[PDB]
Subunit: 92 residues, 4 copies
């Protein structure tokens, strides 16, 4: 049983033009992910919830997160990505 990655990741950049996080769950249990969006000038927003099933990768467009709320375009943001089980997160 492959355990790789960690349960907490932070990405200090973010910008939607008027973007993409890639998550690997190589493990045997589904990952319940929560993402919190941070801003320069207002309180953070979340959790945005999503599942990356066991032995799957998922591409997350920040542009498509809209529950609790869409992320404003042309605004600089940062995100924290938390999970119950270790995942690998990369930002292109």
């Amino acid at each position: 049983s492959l355990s790789i990655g960690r349960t907490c990741w932070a990405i200090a950049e973010g910008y939607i033009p008027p973007e993409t996080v890639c998550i690997l769950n190589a493990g045997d249990e589904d990952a319940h992910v929560e993402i919190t969006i941070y801003y320069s000038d207002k309180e953070p927003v979340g959790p945005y919830r999503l599942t990356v099933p066991a032995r799957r990768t998922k591409h997350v467009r920040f542009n498509d997160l809209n529950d609790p709320a869409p992320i404003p375009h042309d605004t600089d943001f940062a995100s924290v990505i938390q999970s119950n089980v270790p995942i690998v997160v990369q930002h292109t």
Copy 2:
């Protein structure tokens, strides 16, 4: 024997264009028997894809040329785990 790197790497991105590269350094004195597993968004992982990076050598691995057990589909998002018997350094470009 210089030992640098680790035996397990994960790359969360992967895309072959429609119709990329992993750079591996083995700076040590024993050949590295590498296994790569490829993960997908909607189906079980595929692998292991096996290759050797000899002692004191680097190797460029095009995902496009990995085809045993199977070629990786184009225009498909994927992720890889790279495992080795001996520490290696892995860069994805």
Copy 3:
């Protein structure tokens, strides 16, 4: 109750081009971060500290171009920075 990042970061690259370079800092914690930046050069002593605050639960984009007290950073010059904080922060320079 979120502590993430560290109090010390080093960026070995730095270039401001002609106009007429940026660092993103996340402070996910519950205390304001008093940051200090020291700028290093290939051929002279380092310059700093440049001071700024990243408040609790905020992110801040820092344009190196705008840093100018104690001194502006020369354009067309290769530099490096060290970013120190009283509390953990996350620093990325995409």
Copy 4:
């Protein structure tokens, strides 16, 4: 005094077109750096020696390393950078 970085760095990519390493020495002692260059089909070459003085940065063009030997253009390579004192290394 400020100690930051480490004494060993590996860079798995390297290409000189027919290729810059930026090194920070934030410490109070000069860093005597040795670089070894690795190839896909021959023994490694080095050490290439250089100094990054106390409290200085240095840009290192792979194209300008030529003692013991120039690095061939149009060839894939990798490097190991070792130092007596910790340094911070970034590849571009």
